[PDB]
Each structure stands twice: as structure tokens, then as C-alpha cells.
Structure 1
Amino acid sequence: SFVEMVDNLRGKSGQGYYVEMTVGSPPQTLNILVDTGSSNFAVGAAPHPFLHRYYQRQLSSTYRDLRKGVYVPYTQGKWEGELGTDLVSIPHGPNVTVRANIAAITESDKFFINGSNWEGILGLAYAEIARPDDSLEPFFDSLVKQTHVPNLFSLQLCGAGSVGGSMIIGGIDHSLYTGSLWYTPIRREWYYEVIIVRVEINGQDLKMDCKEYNYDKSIVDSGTTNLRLPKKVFEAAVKSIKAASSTEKFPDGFWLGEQLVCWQAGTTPWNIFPVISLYLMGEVTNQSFRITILPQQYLRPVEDDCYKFAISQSSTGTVMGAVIMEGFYVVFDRARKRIGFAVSACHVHDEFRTAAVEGPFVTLDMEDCGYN
């Protein structure tokens, strides 16, 4: 649901995906990063070395001040600014205009990125995690309350098939995937929180208490680049990934996500890097499904062929970031408290292996896999 939004995303590797928006009357055009890992809609509203444009409130006939300040601290970066409401629309989007909350960003630190082409962020997760508090209605919530747009969006993030993709607001576009959608419950409405019931690398169960995979949570987050795994899980995965690829040897800064590794163009040894299967809780009792990630997703290319290890240690739970979401079509079915995965039409290539969404699997005591 529908052709107008196909290919409405762009970006640079490791700097997120953005969609074109306009705010104010007359309309001012900004590129906005699409972030299911937070819930604030915020935009450059003042000069910055890295911004090529920004939101000019005084130039907008429709702007209203909320006379209240705001700040948001992300994993690394943070911004603060001023709350208002203005009229907002997505040009390659549904055909509508909403009055939404906007944080006019006045100061920032390590937020905007030099390469960038985006001037703001669209937090698509739920009011619970919004700043300054849950009474600040998120953008998707206002678009739903104010229009007829169904309460569902879908993200097809593609990986260089200078990245691109689609954000279908309001529905599912059957032209963007193959095979069946498989759905996992949204465990609680705050982040897009899910439960991982099993983990296998090259078909070997990690054999951990399934609570460790969700410790203290597992989320789907398009605003975080890497797959981020709890310490105990990170250690076990890097252990098997090391051993699968031991034929060759790598700097330590490589496994820590720091320094790139290189091979002669067209000779990257993909076969020595294992596939990772994440099993998600399903819709029916004792039933789950798996997504399989290929090394082409977790060895993210940096500009010979050169890559960073795109899995990292977490102390805040599992993060399924952009590299996991790439080559899947991921449906955020808020209306039904579920997230659907299918093989995307921009799926990642290997000459001998494929990324897959497969089910059904039987898995006992999936309830026990949730932390607390």
C-alpha cells in the first residue's frame, strides 16, 4: 500500500536512512532520518557546521511555541532544543498533512554527521520513551489520530544493490518481498521490543539460557547500524565466528569494531564467515521462526574491498540494527502488536547461500526467554 512511497529512502552506509519531509507554511524541505529506536521528531533549527539547511520557525505561518524545552541523549550523540508544533507532510508518502510535535534543535553534540544529507530525525517508537515524557505525542501517533492512515508502516532497507529503500506508511506493499511474512509479538509498547528464543551460527545452537539473548531487552532499531548483542552473547558469537574463519587471522581492533580489514577486490572470502540464525517468538503457542543473516550483512563495507565487523557489545540488550534489517522487509504492525519479517526484493547476494525467513519451528517455554 502503495507505489508512491517505493524508494523514498536514501542514505550513506553507516549514517542511517532518511526520507524527505516538509514542515511549516510555506513548506520547508528537510531530509529526516527514520528511527524506530526512539520517539522524538526533532530537526536542525539553527546553524551547525554539518547542516546545509535547517528549520526556520519565524518563516512559518503555522508554527506554535510550546514554551517548554527538551533534550535527548542517544547511545553517543545528543541534542537539546525547543518544543513546538507545526504542519508536517511526507512528499513521497501518503497524501496528508498533520500537526505534529517537533523539537527545534538549538544545540547538539555528536548528533549531526559530516557526510550527511539529513537535517533531523523521526522517532517512530512509542510515547513511553519519548522526552521530556510520555505526554509528548509521537509523530506516527498524531498522523494516525488525525487521518485515516492505518496504524502500520513497513521498512525495506536496501544495502547498495550509497543505500536506498522504502518506507511504506499505512501498509504493506506486496511488491517489496517474496515468500511469507513471519510475525513476532511486540512484547511491550515502548521500543519495538521482541523476544529471541534461539540463536545458531552455521547451524550450531549457541546453547545459552534463552534469557541471555534478551538481557535486558531485544529491540528492532533502524537508527542503530550494527547488530548489538549482550556481553555474554557477544562473547559466544565472536568466539564461533573467530573459529569458523580461523583459516585467516585478523587484528583485535577488527573484532572490537574499530579497524577495517581488506582483501583484493573480488576476493573477499565470504564462505569462511558463518551465517547467523535468530529465532523469534511466533504467533502461536510453542511456535517460532528464524531469520538468517549472511556475512554480507554483518561485514559492512567501508571505502580493494574493505569492511568493518558490524556486530558490537551491548550493556543495554540486543539491538537488531540496520544491518540486520537490510535485505528483509520488516512490517511494524502496531495495530496488531506485531512485527513481520519477509525476504526483501533487495536481498543480499551470495552465490551459494541466502538470507531466509523460515518457519514454523517448535520451541518450548518461549515465555521463559523474556528478561523479568
Structure 2
Amino acid sequence: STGSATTTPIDSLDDAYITPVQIGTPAQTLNLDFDTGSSDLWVFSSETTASEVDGQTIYTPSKSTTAKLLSGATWSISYGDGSSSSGDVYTDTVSVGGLTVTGQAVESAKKVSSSFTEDSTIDGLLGLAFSTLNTVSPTQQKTFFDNAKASLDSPVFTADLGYHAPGTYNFGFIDTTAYTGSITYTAVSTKQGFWEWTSTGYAVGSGTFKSTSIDGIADTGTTLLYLPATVVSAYWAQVSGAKSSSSVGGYVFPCSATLPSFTFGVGSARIVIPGDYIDFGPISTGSSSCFGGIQSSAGIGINIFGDVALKAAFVVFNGATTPTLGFASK
């Protein structure tokens, strides 16, 4: 089997991407944030505190003939950005782009933090990291991808995120028409539950490439590119007037600037992030100070290849017995 779904930016800055997901019988379609940095499939639901719902589409398990309460199971998750959610658990039929899993754990939110409430366009998350991070207790549950894996033509999914435009998540096959040149594969460590890999270095604009190992995670659920402070300083030093602002919470730059590209290494290959991808616009409406898309990972504890980086590539998440990551230009 295979699946193929379109993923769409939630706003004009590509802050996140939503992908339609069918849950239950008859289908209830929710728009979920596919997140390769976590491993819970959770949804706004009929059980969510009413004051914490503001425009989201909710899953109503009582209206699904295939929904079954997973007796005794609860979940609770906190994310890197400080947001959180929790609730109880159903199993139900879940389909993504024609690919169907029966008995998928669907985690029903009773509580969500304000950040989720305020984002009316995101109805939940669909985790695509390794199932070892799944927070369901007392019986840990598998991700959609883990459940689908044995049925897939090939045990892979791919992320093809668009810049200010729709893109694609595919399951079970590699679309050889979706990228240019070759795919370069690189080793993955699952020791922390993430798609963790080591970049071979970087360049700023037309500058020389610096060979240096950068350990980080491929995370579709993080907006920006978070790298070591040395790297990030070298980038923003090439932008006149750029500075790190503690009051704003990162690097800002004059909105009149033209940003340089940023290149990262995948083995001997190179992925080029165009400068425009690094512009996240005015810090506040009407401001002439703009927020940078490359930020320091210092104090996160890990480097994160988020959407800013991933959308410059066709990315293969290979879930074979020995997982790997592949990157191609497109």
C-alpha cells in the first residue's frame, strides 16, 4: 500500500503545515500538524474543555462506529516550545491520503495549552518520530507510520514541504519526479527517539563551505532552523544591522535587507536554503524589524533542522530496520 496527501501552510509565514486526516467511520476529517519530532497522534475532540476550543474541528468518538475507548489509557505531552496537551485514548480507523490503519491510537485532548487554542487552523498533531517517545500510559502506543509500515510497499515516508505553497507527504514510496539530481542518504541515531543525524557543515551565501559536524534532528513540527551559536553568528554577521535581541527572543534584522542563502551539508552533498526562506517578517505589525529564520539552539539542548531547512529539500524518512535519512534538492 501507499498514501499521498497534500500539506498546506497555515499562514503567510509557513509557521506550520496542516494535512487532512480521516478519522473514524463515517470519516471525520481533521487537519493535523505532521510532526517528525514527536510520536503522539492527538486531536481536539468532544472531550476538550470548551473554553480551550476556538475554531478547531473536533473528533467526536461517539459518532464513530469503529471507535473504542482504550480503557485506562491516558496521555500527557509537553513540547519544546512550552506548549502542552493531555487526555484519554481511543482506537479508531485513521487514513492519510488513501492509506488506512485500523486500530490506531487516537489521543483525545481533555486539556490543551493556550498556544493550541489560539491556533484555530490546527486540529491536532500526528507524530512521526519513533514510537519510543509516545506518551500513552500505562501501555505505550505506536505511531501511524509504525502501524502502517509492514503494509507499505517500502517502509518510508517523505516530506516535500513548500515555500509559501502546498507540498506533499507520501507514505510507502519515493516519487522520483519530485526532486532533482540524487538523494543522499545519511545515518540516523534513534537513541533519543528522534530522526537524529549529523550534517557535514555549512556555508553562508557565496562563502566557502566549512566542514564541521552538526548533530541535529529532522523536525517537521518546528518552524525554524536552530543551530549552534557559532554558526548562527556567522550567518547574521553577513546581514547589515542584524542583531540578537533578548527582548524579542532571537536574531532580528532590518526588513529592508536582502538575506544571504544558507547551505547545509548532507554527506558530500549540499542543500541550499534561499535567503527568502529565512525571512519571517515584522516582529510586530507595522514594524521595520524582521524576525530571522535561523536562530541559536543554545539552551534548547539540541540542534533542530525545522521547516526552514526541510522545505528546501525533498526528505526521505527511511524506517527500514536500520533507519536512515535522505536529502535531495528540488
The alignment's TM-score, normalised by the length of structure 1, stands at 0.76
Q: Aligned with 1:178: secondary structure?
A: coil
> Separation in 2 of the partners of 1:207 and 1:27?
50
Check if 1:291 corresponds to 2:291.
no
> Separation in 1 of the partners of 2:166 and 2:289?
20
Which of 154, 158, 162 is the aligned partner of 2:162?
Answer: 158
Equivalent position amino acid for 1:155 in 2: A
**Superposition map of 1:291-370 within 5 A:** 291-301=271-281, 307-314=290-297, 315-335=300-320, 337-344=323-330
Runs of 5+ consecutive residues of structure 1 not aligned to the other structure: 283-287, 345-372
Equivalent position amino acid for 1:151 in 2: P
Equivalent position amino acid for 2:173 in 1: G
Q: Contact between 2:152 and 2:171, CA under 8 Å: does it hold in 1?
A: no
Cα deviation for residue 116 of structure 1 reads 3.6
Cα deviation for residue 83 of structure 1 reads 1.5
Which moves more between the two structures, 323-332 or 199-208?
199-208
> Separation in 2 of the partners of 1:177 and 1:191?
24
Check if 1:277 corresponds to 2:263.
yes
Equivalent position amino acid for 2:218 in 1: V
Q: Contact between 2:18 and 2:122, CA under 8 Å: does it hold in 1?
A: yes
**Superposition map of 1:174-323 within 5 A:** 174-188=176-190, 190-202=193-205, 203-204=207-208, 210=213, 213-214=214-215, 218-229=216-227, 233-234=228-229, 236-245=230-239, 248-250=240-242, 252-253=244-245, 256-257=249-250, 261-263=254-256, 268-270=257-259, 273=260, 275-280=261-266, 282=267, 288-301=268-281, 307-314=290-297, 315-323=300-308
- Shift in CA distance, 7/83, structure 1 to aligned 2, threshold 3 Å: closer
Runs of 5+ consecutive residues of structure 2 not aligned to the other structure: none
Check if 1:140 corresponds to 2:134.
no
Q: Contact between 2:252 and 2:289, CA under 8 Å: does it hold in 1?
A: no
Q: Aligned with 1:158: secondary structure?
A: coil
**Superposition map of 1:13-24 within 5 A:** 13-24=13-24
> Separation in 2 of the partners of 1:250 and 1:96?
48
Q: Contact between 2:278 and 2:293, CA under 8 Å: does it hold in 1?
A: yes
Counterpart position of 1:79? 85
Q: Aligned with 2:180: secondary structure?
A: strand
Number of residue pairs matched by the alignment: 313
Counterpart position of 1:350? none
Equivalent position amino acid for 1:109 in 2: S
The alignment's TM-score, normalised by the length of structure 2, stands at 0.84
Q: Contact between 1:94 and 1:169, CA under 8 Å: does it hold in 2?
A: no
Cα deviation for residue 89 of structure 1 reads 1.1
Q: Contact between 1:201 and 1:237, CA under 8 Å: does it hold in 2?
A: no
> Separation in 1 of the partners of 2:323 and 2:108?
31
Cα deviation for residue 14 of structure 1 reads 4.3
- Shift in CA distance, 338/148, structure 1 to aligned 2, threshold 3 Å: closer
Q: Contact between 2:157 and 2:171, CA under 8 Å: does it hold in 1?
A: yes
Equivalent position amino acid for 1:82 in 2: D
Cα deviation for residue 6 of structure 1 reads 6.0
Q: Percent identity?
A: 24
Counterpart position of 1:40? 40
- Shift in CA distance, 43/260, structure 1 to aligned 2, threshold 3 Å: farther
Q: Per-residue CA shift, 1:252-286, capped at 9, x if unaligned?
A: 439843767423xxxx424xx3x333223x4xxxx
Q: Contact between 1:88 and 1:97, CA under 8 Å: does it hold in 2?
A: yes
- Shift in CA distance, 107/149, structure 1 to aligned 2, threshold 3 Å: farther
Report the aligned-residue RMSD. 2.7
Q: Contact between 2:14 and 2:163, CA under 8 Å: does it hold in 1?
A: no
Equivalent position amino acid for 2:269 in 1: F
Equivalent position amino acid for 2:156 in 1: L
